[PDB]
């Protein structure tokens, strides 16, 4: 099981990112697909979720912004990004969550808003 | 147990954090040592290691050694969340999520408490692992055991 | 309900500089509104009431300030600890709401 | 030099509310402030020496506090006898620095 | 005890004053007395200082033009300005000076330059 | 030595005052005796006894029994004037004047 993000990178404030993330080894449609970004020098920050069921939620900072998808024949979790804000710049990982919360991470994404 | 690297220092008498508040307590007057070794190899792979759960709060602070291994649903709201997690309720377990290349701050730190207890018994744990020989047939001194 | 905004949306400023931020609502309130500060990690602190007057241990660089649907927060020295979000919060004897907040970062080219 | 700045230039607070007024020094002084109280046409009456001690006769309400660069003045309650200017002198025995002044008026609509 | 002073007036620039003020109360050989003046706009400026044992300490720009005395007889402190200038122009107060500071503030005589 | 008869209240175990603070400082445990009398007419001259010299400004609280003896130019302000006298930089002795 792994998780390889791509797509995270420098954007202009208020700008759009396209944040990808292969999964391996696992069915991301049945599994709660996480992004939590972590600011450099902060903690991790979970700031969206897509259950196994379609129903999504996000951060109140991100909400409105965020949109956590899946493509189930590509099994690729998606996060896509509007409005950026100069604050939303970190290590953001794509993440399995189950009942014990989140289970698997990945390699980690850079997301720089500037 | 197996924690962060920056909750190591939690475990101390005297010191607060999430750990030494929420998860195991060191007393102000605790006799013994904390003892924390790296085993990142052997606890940590590319995968992850998820069998290790750690609880971020608790209703107080945790009583020295007083043991909380309950997974209960915590109400510090206005209504009871009644079992399910539901709005403003939280599971009061979390994995640590180990990596082999993690931060010297993140890698899995065994920290081990090791406590001296001492009750209206007597010492049946010793560690008098210290012999010398035994040479005889002159004027010594000699201590057999504490004899 | 309650439906009131902060501007801007996003703030960034170097050490030592000013700081006026703005929380606006539809209506009038008078005498209701208070300022928190909340870290990636941490809880909300009180750090104004009344709009006007700072809170116990809240810096002379954090002032409040401002009147009618406008209440303008002057932090009159940006540090770094100061980089946070500013929440507009409201008292009242039943539900209330949180605002949005102003997310304050380092400015970096 | 050795310039201190007093914060806010223009308050209007009512009696019984706290004043809270801070002045801050460029650098470090250690304890050479003190806190006085002048209204126009009157000559100002020291109110507190070396940042913490009380002045003999001041009100125990204004309560002074501060070292090296930063100093602060807290009104407990505001009082009519208290609606005036007040300025924050470094020691020195020559002719030392004092306040630009924070003047504290009654508030009103 | 009781500051009052005199000579508060208008002056030519270049000219010379003598600013009077009795002290009442105390006797001035005993105790440090002090020149301070407040310029119309500006907070105080202390300007000289005789103590009660006829040292006289003179800020540098008074230091050689105003001469700080007292008439224990008269019991009253005197300023002799001398070389006066522009800038010379405040209510000066007389002014007791102590261990814990300036106690004692004269009712102040007006000064004008012009 | 010899110092104003006010003065001479300021020596003292732990009290206060500029000669108490920043030329002398006497513990609040002392254990002795403190002897002052007038003796202007031995000293004191009609020009002014300018011969005793006292420190008004120390940089810190002094110790018990220790003495600084000499009389390097005090620095107080933002800038140090490397032993000038000048503005905020003045000599650390005055002379009474008797």
Redesign the interface.
């Known amino acids: 099981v792994q998780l390889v993000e791509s797509g995270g990178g420098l954007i202009q404030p208020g700008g759009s990112l396209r944040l990808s993330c292969a999964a391996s080894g696992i069915i991301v449609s049945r599994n709660y697909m996480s992004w939590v970004r972590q600011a450099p020098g902060k903690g991790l920050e979970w700031v969206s979720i897509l259950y196994a069921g379609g129903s999504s939620f996000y951060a109140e900072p991100v909400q409105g912004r965020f949109t956590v998808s899946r493509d189930n024949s590509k099994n690729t979790l998606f996060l896509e990004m509007n409005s950026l804000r100069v604050e939303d710049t970190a290590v953001y990982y794509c993440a399995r969550d189950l009942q014990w919360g989140i289970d698997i991470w990945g390699q980690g994404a850079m997301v720089t808003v500037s | 147990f197996v924690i962060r690297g920056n909750e190591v220092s939690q475990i101390a008498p005297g010191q607060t954090g999430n750990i030494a508040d929420y998860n195991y307590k060191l007393p102000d007057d605790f006799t013994g040592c904390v003892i924390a070794w790296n085993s990142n190899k052997l606890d940590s792979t590319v995968g992850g290691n998820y069998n290790y759960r750690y609880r971020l709060f608790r209703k107080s602070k945790l009583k020295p050694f007083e043991r909380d291994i309950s997974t209960e649903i915590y109400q510090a709201g206005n209504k009871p969340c009644n079992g399910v997690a539901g709005v403003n309720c939280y599971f009061p377990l979390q994995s640590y999520g180990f990596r082999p290349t993690y931060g010297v701050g993140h890698q899995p730190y065994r920290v081990v408490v090791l406590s001296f207890e001492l009750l209206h018994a007597p010492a049946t744990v010793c560690g008098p692992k210290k012999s010398t020989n035994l040479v005889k047939n002159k004027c010594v001194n000699f201590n057999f055991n504490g004899l | 309900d309650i439906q009131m905004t902060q501007t801007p ?4 400023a170097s050490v030592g500089d000013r700081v006026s931020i703005s929380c606006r609502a539809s209506q009038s309130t008078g005498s209701w509104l208070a300022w928190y500060q909340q870290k ?2 941490k809880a909300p602190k009180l750090l104004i009431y009344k709009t ?3 809170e116990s241990g809240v810096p ?1 660089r954090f ?1 409040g300030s401002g009147s009618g649907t406008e209440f303008t927060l002057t932090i ?1 020295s940006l540090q770094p600890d100061d980089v946070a ?1 500013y929440y507009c919060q409201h008292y009242d004897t039943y539900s209330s709401t949180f605002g ?2 102003t ?3 380092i ?3």
């Open positions: 949306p996003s703030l960034s990636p990690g006007s007057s700072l002379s002032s009159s979000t949005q907040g997310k304050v970062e400015k970096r080219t």
